[PDB]
């Protein structure tokens, strides 16, 4: 999770304190969309393989990102 914290925080110019598990990416951390698509793709650069659209649709806040990774490991 800690390295997940630093990835999204680099990925969109926010420090790690912003990353509370249920801070949303858009309502809270302040991002458009490519920002979230390119983050998710960036998170698949952890080799969580090609997590499906049908599970990424439900990603809204950083905790779901901790899910779906540790699911598709």
């Amino acid at each position: 999770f800690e390295d997940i914290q630093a990835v999204i925080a680099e990925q969109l110019n926010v420090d790690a304190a912003q990353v509370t598990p249920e801070a949303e990416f858009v309502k809270d951390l302040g991002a458009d969309s490519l920002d979230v698509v390119e983050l998710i793709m960036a998170l698949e650069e952890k080799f969580g393989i090609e997590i499906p659209d049908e599970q990424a649709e439900k990603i809204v806040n950083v905790g779901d990102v901790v899910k779906y990774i540790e699911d598709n490991k």
Binding site: S33, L34, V37, E38, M41, D53
Partner: protein, 248 residues
């Protein structure tokens, strides 16, 4: 009303939405309208029964506009019943919006095949059944974003833009037999296709539309009617913007 020299019209995808309201309008001007549907006939028959009860001539007909053999037989049956087809309206359209990097060649083709290919078959079969009768008007429902482009609609814009350029060439091809092709490029209309959309993104649009409202499907429809009617008899290869000022 508005004068028409023709008698019947085929309107692909006419069951709901702008296609429905095109059929109501052309019907109430005393045309025979052939409401096309692809899947569930409960809305198309309901429209047909609405129109006959008003005292207009209507019908329903089943085909996938993107299916050549299914399309060609459809018009042949229309000719067989009525002795010819005067007016085609290529309304049938689908939308699938995705950022290009998440978009897939299926999502590109799904839109191209349904929005563009269907219109090609239409215009083509439109030349065939109308050439010998030295008369015809066709109208392809395009979109503002075929003229402007838009974010997340690289597949939809590709197809609408092809439709506008393709319609121009058909208008060349059918001009000597008095077959006219025109496009209607609507702005943002209050229908089924965009109904599900964020109010944050919807009032976003309204404040960019000089007329300060979303257009009515009846308003796209009466512009299509003018372009098919005889009042437009010198107008071909044109594109009529019905976008309330949203793009000029």
């Amino acid at each position: 009303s508005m004068q028409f020299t023709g008698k019947n019209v085929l309107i692909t995808g006419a069951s709901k939405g702008i296609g429905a309201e095109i059929a109501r309008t052309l019907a109430s001007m005393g045309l025979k309208v052939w409401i096309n549907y692809r899947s569930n006939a409960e809305v198309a028959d309901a429209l047909k029964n609405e129109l006959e009860e008003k005292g207009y001539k209507a019908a329903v007909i089943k085909f996938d506009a993107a299916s050549e053999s299914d399309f060609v037989e459809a018009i042949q049956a229309i000719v067989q019943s009525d002795g010819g087809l005067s007016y085609l309206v290529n309304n049938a359209g689908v939308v699938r919006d995705k950022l290009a990097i998440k978009m897939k060649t299926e999502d590109f083709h799904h839109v191209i095949d349904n929005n563009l290919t269907s219109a090609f078959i239409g215009c083509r079969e439109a030349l065939k059944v109308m050439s010998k009768s030295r008369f015809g008007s066709v109208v392809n429902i395009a979109s503002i974003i075929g003229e402007r482009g838009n974010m997340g609609q690289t597949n939809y814009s590709a197809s609408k833009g092809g439709m506008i350029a393709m319609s121009k060439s058909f208008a060349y091809e059918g001009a000597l037999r008095n077959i006219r092709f025109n496009s209607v490029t609507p702005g943002f209309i209050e229908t089924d296709m965009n109904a599900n959309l964020k109010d944050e993104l919807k009032a976003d649009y309204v404040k960019n539309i000089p007329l300060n409202r979303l257009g009515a499907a009846k308003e796209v429809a009466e512009a299509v009617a003018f372009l098919l009617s005889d009042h437009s008899s010198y107008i071909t290869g044109e594109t009529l913007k019905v976008n309330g000022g949203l793009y000029m």
